[PDB]
Design a protein around this ligand. Structure first.
Ligand SMILES: Nc1ncnc2c1ncn2[C@@H]1O[C@H](COP(=O)(O)OP(=O)(O)O)[C@@H](O)[C@H]1O
Ligand SMILES: Nc1ncnc2c1ncn2[C@@H]1O[C@H](COP(=O)(O)OP(=O)(O)O)[C@@H](O)[C@H]1O
Lengths: 176, 721, 57, 205
């Protein structure tokens, strides 16, 4: 018996006011304190390339970076400007993300595609884990309807102005 | 908070930047989110954020296209402000920059803009400049109108428009075709070394202004022609923003007395007036050759003028002078005195990895066919430098152009963009160009990291560990060495029968250290002896220092002792001119230079014993013939690259080949391989090596090391243990 | 991170998971001691290879 | 002290640049008071084959310039010249004539009390446990030279260092490290060479 991971499905609306900020000219003037860290890293980078060290020592440097994350938080950008968010284990399969989105869509039967942050298509039939797909510990996915249904939607003059169920949209939160 | 230092990017894409994951965690943004970057002169850029395992926590990695839009350079600071409110665009109007579209005409949307944005969802902002490559041309575009403002995300439903004359570039903006750090392939370390030496005195000169110690004023780059010496000097000036003033020997030397010195000192005056500035003097050996080699007034007078101008740099603040030569010993030694040109960097010859990187850079604009493999090319282009790989790519392009242009038949002042877009360069055109190209650096010694790893060496488990300990222990426990008054050894001699892996051991430790391997073979030691040119030994040890971390392998230490007789003997003894210079140079090498000196001999009884005196090859390892379990491991390693049938009993062979060396087991493997090939050819006019091929090979393969030779090594080994 | 307890319907955090499920299984002994001990054998023991050997024996 | 080592005498011989000998002696005249030491005076004879070589004599270009400069050097300059050789049977006998290195001193292998003194001196650079019996070691190393006692000291040190490093994967060199070193250390001067050295010294009386 194990507790079921609660997707905590939410839809968010960005606020344009979050992008309105002006910087004084002096905010871009590099300090002596920053220069000391930058000059130290310049000398350390040359020292790293310079040292005669065996792979066992090289491991100790790599090992410092490696082992942090076992969960992920995924967000999907929808054509209607809404952001759909939910939580997953890092080893969860891509099929759970499709299902998660289908349960939130106003029409769960209407074929769609999810694209990764680099433009790489994520296929629903490919049973890969989120840590194998490059979606850990967080990622934004791009939502688009299948081209076949988009041609019928456009030809009929139907504006796809709602992607998600009114059942979730009635609880939309602003980003903070 | 939320302010990071601008660094170089690895990702070649122009719409993304990379942050270290903890900073994305503090900003509560995810991979793929769109953010704004605040730069200088009240400008901003919009891009997608990713992450990797190499970015420093306090840095943001962005390429030249993004940096130019922000009017920032490496080392500056920018602010990150997520903008999740960005919407999808409806119409964007993009027009080319005139500076890059000349002599070419056609439907630029179909060739460049359409595939560039096709399902890419790149953020776009009005006024941004972005680069699209193709058709052997690099074309950059400016965004002049966006239906939403001031930025949006391009989508498959966004209208992409392009009508109007090309736009004239603003004088404040630099072209993306200027050389930068992303245009340099191999020799990445040397570039990092220059960064430290150059950025400090030019960005932070005040460290030396108040203090009585003056900075380094000159950097001498040297190596074979065509390795990028000029390219690096230009890229550094462009990346830091300093003014680049170009000088070269022939330009000054072709002038008459008075005119030559006037032009030389004028450049120095301009460098100060426009400081910060970098003065690059090319062919330094031409303007300032060795004094004892010339008696002309101009050749000596121009050196005196250069020496005074270099010394006058104490007042010319924020100016550094770089120079390029073929060899550090081809220039007037006065220039290399403290101050002036006191620091130097060996650029060297790109290795197989660097050559691949160089080819990938030159092919950026080329439409390569699916059959093209630049790694196969890089492996074949031994002895080539970047100048030759540039010619190789050009020749491959010209071959493709001729083959298709003869059919296209477009005779006009401009070329169609569509026909260039459909022009692909095949592997046959690269192979043809390889046959026509001739390396310019085939005579110079090639030094690179070897490809031999520990998995390629059978047996010798204790020697593998010993070589690793000799590298990590001097730095993992320096207190224990100091406590007991012990100086760590900096070299080892290998002795024993031939064909047991002496060379492989030196390469494998270099491989796993990722260190450069310098191979000195018998013929080279003999050439110096016979030609009375032992002075060149200093160049070998100087190369080892410049190549550090490296393994300096002196093979066939007995080559001269044998040339003088060895078994019979002429009028000489054990000492000779070459070994005497080698011993002298070794005494000048410090344990902190990251140079590990390895020797090998097949006749340790006739090598100058001085090589084993304290301070030289203090470690001494015996390499015996492999035992039964090692011979099996050797056979498996030698057959690692070939298909072997299940009927082949490698343990049976190892049991018989009791007196065989590792090299002798290789002959068996190679004979079986050749026999398998012969049978396959006969059947075509079988696909794997069968026991019958090994059994036939056993009819010819013999041990190369006799029982008497084994005892000869045992006697020496027991004498010194 | 939030989780739902399949035995109670309670909303739990990453740290509260085992505490609530273990309690629900120990309470279940008042309704069906056999079903409660079956859940305890599989749920409380982190080493599932030993659980499979124990159950088979 | 002017140190002219074998490789320097060989460099002049190999390159036929014996003129540089005059500069060496000029250093002695200008550096006075000084001691001018020519090490491995037989390095050239050995570089000529030593035991066999060609059919020529012991004289050569470098030693001839050395002999010439010695004859032109007065004791009033406070310069004393010392030579050393490990193969006196092949040294040019001219160097031993009046006006040159006319004094001869035989340096035998150290005896028991001297070998202990050598071991104690060589171990001044490292921690050594009180259980180490240096007199017992000296009694065994009867045919060893001082250079060979150094190898024993360094070999035992190497073992102590290796064990100390391994213990973290010790504070001083233990008797076991010296007794283990004795299993690999060997004398560099064989019994045949010891008799040759003694018989030569005896012949000179
Ligand atoms: N390491 C390198 N990486 C990339 N390109 C290189 C490299 N070395 C040489 N090249 C290319 O070869 C040519 C070198 O010619 P040039 O700029 O005159 O420099 P130099 O003659 O000093 O090597 C350029 O086209 C340059 O791009
Ligand atoms: N210990 C070994 N393990 C695997 N192969 C070996 C070994 N010793 C020799 N060989 C084979 O012999 C060949 C020559 O070895 P090399 O190290 O060049 O000999 P040497 O050092 O005497 O020149 C190699 O190509 C290798 O295949």
């Amino acid at each position: 018996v194990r507790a079921k991971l609660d997707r905590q499905r939410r839809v968010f609306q960005p606020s344009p006011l979050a992008s309105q900020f002006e910087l004084p000219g002096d905010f871009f003037n590099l300090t002596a304190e920053e220069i000391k860290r930058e000059q130290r890293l310049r000398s350390e980078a040359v020292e790293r390339l310079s040292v005669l060290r065996t792979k066992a020592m090289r491991e100790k440097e790599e090992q410092r970076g490696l082992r942090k994350y076992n969960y992920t938080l995924l967000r999907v950008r929808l054509p209607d400007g809404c952001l759909l968010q939910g939580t997953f284990y890092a080893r969860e399969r891509l099929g759970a993300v499709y299902g998660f989105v289908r349960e939130a869509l106003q029409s769960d039967w209407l074929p769609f595609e999810l694209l990764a942050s680099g433009g790489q298509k994520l296929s629903e039939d490919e049973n890969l884990a989120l840590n194998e797909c490059g979606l850990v510990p967080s990622a934004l996915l791009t939502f688009s309807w299948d081209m076949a249904v988009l041609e019928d939607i456009k030809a009929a003059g139907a504006e796809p102005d709602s992607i998600l169920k009114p059942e979730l949209l009635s609880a939309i939160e602003k980003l903070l | 908070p939320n302010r990071l230092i601008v660094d170089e990017a690895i990702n070649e894409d122009n719409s993304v930047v990379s942050l270290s994951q903890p900073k994305m965690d503090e900003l509560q943004l995810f991979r793929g989110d769109t953010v704004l970057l605040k730069g200088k002169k009240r400008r901003e850029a919009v891009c997608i954020v990713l992450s990797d395992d190499t970015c420093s926590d306090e840095k943001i990695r962005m390429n030249r296209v993004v940096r130019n839009n922000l009017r920032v350079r490496l080392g500056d600071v920018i602010s990150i402000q997520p903008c999740p409110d960005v919407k999808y665009g409806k119409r964007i109007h993009v027009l080319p920059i005139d500076d890059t579209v000349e002599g070419i005409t056609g439907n630029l949307f179909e060739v460049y803009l359409k595939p560039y944005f096709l399902e890419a969802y790149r953020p776009i902002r009005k006024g941004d400049i972005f680069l699209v490559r193709g058709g052997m041309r690099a074309v950059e575009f400016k965004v002049v109108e966006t239906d939403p403002s001031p930025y949006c995300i391009v989508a498959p439903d966004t209208v992409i428009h392009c009508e109007g004359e090309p736009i004239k570039r603003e004088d404040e903006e630099e072209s993306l075709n200027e050389v930068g750090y992303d245009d340099i392939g191999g020799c990445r370390k040397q570039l990092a070394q220059i960064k430290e030496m150059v950025e400090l005195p030019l960005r932070h000169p005040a460290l030396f202004k108040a203090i009585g110690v003056k900075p380094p004023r000159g950097i001498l780059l040297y190596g074979p022609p065509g390795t990028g010496k000029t390219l690096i000097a230009r890229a550094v000036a462009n990346e830091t923003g300093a003014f680049f003033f170009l000088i070269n020997g022939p330009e000054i030397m072709s002038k008459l007395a008075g005119e030559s010195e006037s032009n030389l000192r004028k450049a120095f005056e301009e460098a100060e007036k426009n400081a910060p500035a970098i003065i690059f003097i090319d062919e330094l050996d031409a303007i300032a050759p060795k004094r004892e080699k010339t008696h002309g007034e101009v050749e000596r007078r121009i050196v005196s003028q250069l020496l005074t101008l270099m010394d006058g740099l104490k007042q010319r603040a924020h100016v550094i002078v770089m120079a390029a030569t073929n060899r550090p010993n081809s220039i007037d030694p006065a220039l290399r005195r403290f101050g002036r040109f006191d620091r130097e960097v060996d650029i060297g010859i790109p290795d197989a990895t660097g050559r691949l990187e160089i080819l990938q850079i030159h092919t950026k604009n080329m439409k390569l066919a699916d059959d093209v493999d630049l790694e196969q090319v890089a492996n074949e282009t031994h002895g080539h430098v970047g100048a030759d790989l540039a010619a190789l790519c050009s020749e491959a392009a010209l071959q493709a152009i001729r083959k298709k242009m003869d059919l296209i038949d477009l005779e006009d002042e401009t070329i169609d963009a569509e026909v260039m877009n459909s022009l692909a360069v095949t592997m046959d055109d690269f192979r043809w160009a390889l046959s026509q190209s001739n390396p310019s650096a085939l005579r110079e010694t090639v030094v690179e990291v070897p490809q031999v790893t520990w998995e390629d060496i059978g047996g010798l488990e204790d020697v593998k560990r010993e070589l690793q300990e000799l590298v990590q222990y001097p730095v993992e426990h320096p207190d224990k060495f100091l406590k007991f008054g012990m100086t760590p050894s900096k070299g080892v001699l290998f002795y024993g029968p031939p064909g047991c892996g002496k060379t492989l051991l030196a390469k494998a430790i270099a491989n796993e250290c990722q260190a450069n391997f310098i191979s000195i073979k018998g013929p080279e030691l003999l050439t110096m002896w016979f030609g009375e040119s032992e002075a060149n030994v200093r160049e070998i040890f100087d190369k080892a220092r410049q190549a550090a971390p490296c393994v300096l392998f002196f093979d066939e230490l007995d080559s001269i002792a044998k040339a003088r007789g060895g078994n019979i003997g002429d009028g000489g003894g054990a000492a000779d001119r070459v070994i005497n210079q080698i011993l002298t140079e070794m005494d000048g090498m410090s344990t902190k230079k990251n140079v590990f000196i390895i020797g090998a001999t097949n006749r340790p009884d006739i090598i100058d014993p001085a090589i084993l005196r304290p301070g030289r090859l203090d470690q001494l390892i015996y390499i015996p013939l492999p035992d039964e379990k090692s011979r099996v491991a050797i056979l498996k390693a030698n057959l690692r690259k070939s298909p072997v049938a299940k009927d082949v009993d490698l343990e049976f062979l190892a049991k018989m080949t009791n007196g065989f060396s590792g090299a002798d087991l290789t002959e068996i493997c190679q004979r079986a391989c050749k026999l398998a090939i012969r049978e396959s050819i006969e059947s075509e006019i079988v696909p794997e090596i069968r026991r019958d091929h090994f059994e036939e090979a056993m009819r010819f393969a013999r041990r190369s090391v006799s029982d008497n030779d084994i005892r000869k090594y045992e006697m020496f080994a027991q004498t010194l243990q | 991170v939030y989780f739902t307890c399949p035995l109670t319907g309670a909303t739990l955090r990453k740290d509260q998971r085992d505490a609530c499920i273990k309690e629900a299984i120990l309470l279940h002994f008042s309704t069906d001691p056999v079903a409660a001990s079956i859940m305890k054998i599989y749920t409380f023991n982190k080493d599932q290879d030993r659980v499979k050997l124990g159950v088979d024996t």
